[PDB]
C-alpha cells in the first residue's frame, strides 16, 4: 500500500509573445499546451526509468 504523489508544472507567457507567435504560424494556445504535455510525459520517463 502506497499513497500517491504529485508532479506539477507551469510555464507562463506574455500576451505580446502570444500575439506575435500567431504571426509566425504557430497556434499559440495549442502550441503551449503541447509543451507541458510533452515535458510532463517526458519527465515521467526520467522517473519510471530511474525508478527501475
Amino acid at each position: 500500500q502506497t499513497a500517491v504523489k504529485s508532479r506539477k508544472l507551469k510555464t507562463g507567457i506574455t500576451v505580446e509573445l502570444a500575439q506575435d507567435l500567431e504571426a509566425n504560424g504557430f497556434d499559440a494556445p495549442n502550441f503551449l499546451e503541447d509543451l507541458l504535455a510533452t515535458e510532463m510525459a517526458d519527465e515521467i520517463n526520467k522517473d519510471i526509468l530511474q525508478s527501475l
Binding site: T11, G12, I13, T14, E16, L17, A18, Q19, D20, L21, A23, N24, G25, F26
Partner: protein, 52 residues
C-alpha cells in the same frame, strides 16, 4: 517566464529577425511596393507631325 522580447529597432536586426527574447521572427511582412510615377508627355500637335 519566456518574455516575448522585441527587435532592438535596428534595421540590421529587424530585417534578419534577430530578437531579444524568444521565438525569433521568420521575417518582416510585405506591405507593398512603391515605384516612381511616369511623367506625362506634351502632345506633339503643337508642332508639325508629318509621318514619313
Amino acid at each position: 517566464a519566456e518574455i516575448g522580447g522585441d527587435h532592438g529597432y535596428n534595421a540590421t536586426n529587424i530585417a534578419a529577425g534577430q530578437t531579444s527574447g524568444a521565438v525569433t521572427q521568420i521575417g518582416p511582412a510585405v506591405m507593398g511596393m512603391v515605384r516612381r510615377a511616369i511623367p506625362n508627355l506634351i502632345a506633339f500637335d503643337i508642332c508639325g507631325v508629318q509621318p514619313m
